[PDB]
Amino acid sequence: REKLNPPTPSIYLESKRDAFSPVLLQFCTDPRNPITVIRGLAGSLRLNLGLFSTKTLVEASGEHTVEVRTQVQQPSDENWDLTGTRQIWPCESSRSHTTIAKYAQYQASSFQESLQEEHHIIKFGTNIDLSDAKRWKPQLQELLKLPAFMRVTSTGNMLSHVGHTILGMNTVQLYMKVPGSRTPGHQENNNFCSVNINIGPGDCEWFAVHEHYWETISAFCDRHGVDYLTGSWWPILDDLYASNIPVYRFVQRPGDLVWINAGTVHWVQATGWCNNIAWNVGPLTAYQYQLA
Numbered sequence: 001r002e003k004l005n006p007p008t009p010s011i012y013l014e015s016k017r018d019a020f021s022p023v024l025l026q027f028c029t030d031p032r033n034p035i036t037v038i039r040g041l042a043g044s045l046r047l048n049l050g051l052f053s054t055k056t057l058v059e060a061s062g063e064h065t066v067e068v069r070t071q072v073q074q075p076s077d078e079n080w081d082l083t084g085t086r087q088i089w090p091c092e093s094s095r096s097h098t099t100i101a102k103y104a105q106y107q108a109s110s111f112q113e114s115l116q117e118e119h120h121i122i123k124f125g126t127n128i129d130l131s132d133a134k135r136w137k138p139q140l141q142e143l144l145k146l147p148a149f150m151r152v153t154s155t156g157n158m159l160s161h162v163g164h165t166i167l168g169m170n171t172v173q174l175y176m177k178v179p180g181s182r183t184p185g186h187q188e189n190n191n192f193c194s195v196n197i198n199i200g201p202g203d204c205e206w207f208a209v210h211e212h213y214w215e216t217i218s219a220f221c222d223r224h225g226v227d228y229l230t231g232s233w234w235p236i237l238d239d240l241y242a243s244n245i246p247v248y249r250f251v252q253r254p255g256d257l258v259w260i261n262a263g264t265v266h267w268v269q270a271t272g273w274c275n276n277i278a279w280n281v282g283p284l285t286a287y288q289y290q291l292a
C-alpha cells in the first residue's frame with residue numbers, strides 16, 4: 001500500500017560546484033533511480049530560461065510549421081472510454097500542423113482566460129526542433145552551460161565544425177503545453193538517458209516505473225489492443241497497483257531538471273501552462289558498474 005508510492009529521488013543544489021561533479025553523475029545514473037529530479041541547478045547555473053519562452057520562440061521562428069496534438073482534457077489519473085463508463089489504456093491524439101505563432105496565440109489566450117477567482121479538448125505543440133545553430137544559436141549556447149554529463153554536446157563545447165553545423169535534426173526538442181497536455185507512456189529511445197527542463201510558469205506532473213516492469217506494462221497494452229512500442233497509451237494506475245508495481249509520482253516545477261534513466265517507463269501531463277525542453281545524453285545508465 002505504501003511501497004507502491006515510493007519517494008522520487010531528488011537533489012537540491014545550493015551551489016553550482018556540486019553540479020560539475022561525478023558524485024551527482026553517479027546519483028543520477030544509479031539504475032535504482034528510474035528518474036532523478038534535480039532542483040536548484042537552473043538557478044545555480046543562471047540559465048537564461050527566458051530564451052525558451054514562447055515569446056522568444058515566436059520572435060525567432062514564429063512562421064515555422066510544427067506538429068500539434070489534440071486531446072480530450074482529463075485529470076491525470078483518468079482515461080475514459082467512449083461511453084464514459086470505464087477507464088482504458090489507449091490514449092487518443094489527433095495530429096495536425098500549425099505555426100509556432102498560431103500555437104503561441106492559443107497558449108497565451110487560454111492562459112489569459114484562466115485568471116478568474118475560484119468535456120473539453122486541448123492542444124499541445126510537440127517535437128519543436130531547436131537543433132539548428134543557424135536559427136537557435138542563443139538557445140543552444142545556453143544549453144552548453146550545463147555539466148558535460150547532462151550536456152547536449154557531451155564534453156564538447158562547440159556548435160560548428162570547420163564551418164558546418166554539428167547537431168543532427170531533432171537533437172534538442174521543445175514542447176509547448178497547456179493544462180492537460182499529455183506525453184503518453186514510453187521508454188527513451190535507444191536505451192539512452194535523457195534530460196528534461198520545465199521553463200514554467202506552470203508545472204508538469206510525472207509518472208514513472210522501473211524498467212524491470214516493462215514487460216508487464218506491454219502485456220497490459222496487448223490486452224487493451226494497443227501497441228506498446230509504437231502506440232499511444234496512458235496506464236490505468238489501479239492496474240499497476242493491483243500487479244504490485246510501484247509508481248513514482250512527482251511534480252516538475254519551473255527550473256527543475258528531470259534525469260530519465262534508460263528503460264524507465266514514464267508518462268507526463270502538464271497541469272499548468274509551460275514549455276519543456278529535452279534532449280538525450282547517451283547510454284550512461286549504470287556506467288559506474290565499469291569502475292567496480
Ligand SMILES: O=C(O)c1ccc(O)c2ncccc12
Binds near residue numbers: 194196268
Ligand atoms: O512532454 C514532455 O515534457 C516529455 C517529457 C518526457 C519525455 O521523455 C518526453 N518524450 C517525448 C516527448 C515529450 C516528453
Ligand code: NA
Binds near residue numbers: 109113
Ligand atoms: Na477569449
Ligand code: NI
Binds near residue numbers: 127129
Ligand atoms: Ni519535425
Ligand code: NI
Binds near residue numbers: 186187188
Ligand atoms: Ni521521451
